[PDB]
Amino acid sequence: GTGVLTESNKKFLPFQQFGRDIADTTDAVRDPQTLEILDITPCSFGGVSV
Amino acid sequence: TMSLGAENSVAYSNNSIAIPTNFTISVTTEILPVSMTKTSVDCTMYICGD
Ligand SMILES: *[C@@H]1O[C@H](CO)[C@@H](O[C@@H]2O[C@H](CO)[C@@H](O)[C@H](O)[C@H]2NC(C)=O)[C@H](O)[C@H]1NC(C)=O
């Protein structure tokens, strides 16, 4: 994927790996090397008018 | 079964009339929608991600 990985305060259960959104897309991940939780945010975008 | 309102009988005859001797001033409220909320959809960003 493509996005911004931010430090999160999500409380994952020890058997959980990913945290999903309403649209069943990946919203939070668990780092496999060090046991920390990250949030994924899409990068900045917006409409343009001329 | 539903009720269509209170039953009434107008006391009509061929030489009788009814005339008000007093009145009242009513203030009623009428609510009308005018314009809904404007929306725009980015089709490429909706259908596809990056
Ligand atoms: C017409 O109706 C009005 C009510 O809308 C009457 O006014 C009331 O009269 C009584 C009797 O004096 C008072 O106690 C109330 O305070 C009045 N109400 C208001 C809002 O002023 C009025 O008297 C009636 N007129 C006639 C000729 O019948």
Ligand SMILES: *[C@@H]1O[C@H](CO)[C@@H](O)[C@H](O)[C@H]1NC(C)=O
């Ligand atoms: C007017 O009404 C009365 C009573 O309701 C009745 O007797 C009379 O016939 C009526 N007039 C006519 C022209 O029908």
